Design a protein around this ligand. Structure first.
Ligand code: HEM
Ligand code: HEM
Ligand SMILES: *[C@@H]1O[C@H](CO)[C@@H](O)[C@H](O)[C@H]1NC(C)=O
Lengths: 141, 168, 143
């Protein structure tokens, strides 16, 4: 569960992510595709090569969704209701892929923000990404 | 062909065997080259001269430092008990496969070309030595760039044997 | 699965600059902070409530050094991981009853620590190689 201190740390970390969110998400998607190729089965229509414009656009969309979740950290299920329905029903993405993407996002943030990825901030960001994944995987069946 | 280039064949208790290339980098490769006495290791591959038979048993090298004087002296080498089917045989070409030298010249980096085929020093016919081969020879001996290729025994005829290999 | 020579070279090159005395302790502290149920196994290490207490714990740092040394030992024998980790897996399964998923969590946390330490040098290719490495370590350390 996200404590108020954890919410503060997540808000600060994503604020210092700032405008680099789109390419952070693109890098996280690339890391998920390379490290865990089993997640590529959910993108059969995407060009999954390095530096892909389509992967970059999807990473921008993912980071915009994460920004909306951070801004609505107290109402995340309502903020991600459309995405929850989408991932759970239309795409039927298995939650292990969500945890893999959360790990890859954490790796990207650690590689790009080493000064601000403190163990407390790392734990808070992991909790926030777990909350996002749980909201998106809740309706999975 | 040469004693210091080819697959690593292992004789343990009169049993033929070949080294598997799993956990076999250049660090273990130069240990074999040092063990045979042919300088350091150049590549884990060789230009095939003759066919060799296939042996069921394999020598597996987990890992060892690379400064050892012999392969047996480095820690935890496995002899048999596993199949090198997923991996490949361990090849090596040591630095003395074709080690050049310049003799007969009164200046440091000029003279009749002699190449050591493992242990024997022999001359080279000038029809088998191109400008690229001479460039590689000058580079290897740390003599820079080739100035000229002088055939017809310019620095005197060598005594011994003449190699029959054209350097491509 | 066999690890490609390029991936092996990348892993070895990135591990050459890894601070053995600090990276393992950092990874273990991060594991105990992010996943607090892993503090259950280290109740003899003293205070582990505050994240600063976890990261500043000398016993945690020493055990992280030992864990990272075990990672290095498994790295030197990437092709033989079950044989090298049989004793440690038996220890964790029987004497400590550590869930195998904790090994995967520690591998992921170690990958995060490596990325945090090396910045952009932790490229997606070398991260994929290290994910293969930590997956092999965890599978060899499990069951
Ligand atoms: C924190 C985790 C995630 C977030 C924030 C997220 C966010 C998003 C967003 C914003 C979209 C755009 C949907 C639209 O615009 O209509 C999307 C689509 C999609 N997502 Fe995710 N997602 C996450 C996890 C995942 C994972 C792990 C996978 C697969 C392994 C996945 C697979 C997909 C697919 C296939 C689409 C459809 C894109 C397309 O058809 O072009 N999602 N996601
Ligand atoms: C993932 C890779 C891991 C490796 C390579 C590793 C390695 C080691 C090593 C080298 C030891 C020392 C063995 C001894 O002293 O006899 C050890 C012991 C121990 N490990 Fe792990 N470990 C790993 C993961 C974990 C995790 C995730 C936990 C807990 C969640 C854990 C809990 C312990 C404990 C409690 C001990 C004994 C502490 C003590 O002896 O004082 N280990 N492990
Ligand atoms: C090789 O180097 C190691 C250092 O790790 C040393 O312990 C060993 O004695 C060296 N071996 C030789 C033959 O010099």
């Amino acid at each position: 569960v996200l404590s108020p201190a954890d919410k503060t740390n997540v808000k600060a970390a994503w604020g210092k992510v700032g405008a680099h969110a789109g390419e952070y998400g693109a890098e996280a998607l690339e890391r998920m595709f390379l490290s865990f190729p089993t997640t590529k089965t959910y993108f059969p229509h995407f060009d999954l090569s390095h530096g892909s414009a389509q992967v970059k656009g999807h990473g921008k969309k993912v980071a915009d969704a994460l920004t909306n979740a951070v801004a609505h950290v107290d109402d995340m299920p309502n903020a991600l209701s459309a995405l929850s329905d989408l991932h759970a029903h239309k795409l039927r993405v298995d939650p292990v892929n969500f945890k893999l993407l959360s790990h890859c996002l954490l790796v990207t943030l650690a590689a790009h923000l080493p000064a601000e990825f403190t163990p407390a901030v790392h734990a808070s960001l992991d909790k926030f990404l777990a909350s996002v994944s749980t909201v998106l995987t809740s309706k999975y069946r | 062909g040469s004693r210091c280039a080819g697959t690593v064949e292992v004789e343990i208790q009169r049993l033929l065997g070949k080294v598997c290339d799993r956990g076999w980098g250049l660090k273990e490769a130069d240990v074999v080259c040092r063990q045979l006495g042919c300088g350091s290791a150049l590549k884990t591959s060789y230009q095939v001269y003759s066919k060799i038979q296939a042996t069921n048993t394999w020598l597996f090298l987990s890992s060892c430092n690379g400064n050892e004087t012999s392969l047996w002296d480095c820690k935890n080498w496995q002899w048999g008990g596993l199949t090198c089917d997923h991996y490949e045989e361990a090849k090596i070409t040591c630095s003395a496969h074709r080690e050049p030298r310049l003799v007969g010249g009164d200046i440091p980096c000029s003279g009749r070309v002699e190449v050591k085929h493992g242990d024997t020093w022999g001359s080279i016919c000038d029809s088998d030595f191109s400008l690229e081969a001479a460039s590689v020879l000058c580079r290897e001996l740390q003599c820079g760039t080739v100035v000229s290729i002088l055939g017809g025994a310019h620095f005197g005829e060598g005594n011994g044997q003449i190699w029959a290999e054209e350097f491509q | 699965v066999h690890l490609t020579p390029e991936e092996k070279s990348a892993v070895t090159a990135l591990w050459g600059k890894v601070n053995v005395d600090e990276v393992g302790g950092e990874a273990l502290g991060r594991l105990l902070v992010v996943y607090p149920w892993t503090q259950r196994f280290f109740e003899s290490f003293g205070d582990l409530s505050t994240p600063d207490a976890v990261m500043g714990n000398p016993k945690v740092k020493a055990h992280g050094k030992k864990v990272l040394g075990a990672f290095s030992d498994g790295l030197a024998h990437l092709d033989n991981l079950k044989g090298t980790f049989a004793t440690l897996s038996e220890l964790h399964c029987d004497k400590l009853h550590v869930d195998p998923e904790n090994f995967r969590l520690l591998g992921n946390v170690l990958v995060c620590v490596l990325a945090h330490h090396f910045g952009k040098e932790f490229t997606p290719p070398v991260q994929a190689a290290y994910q293969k490495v930590v997956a092999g370590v965890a599978n060899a350390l499990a069951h």
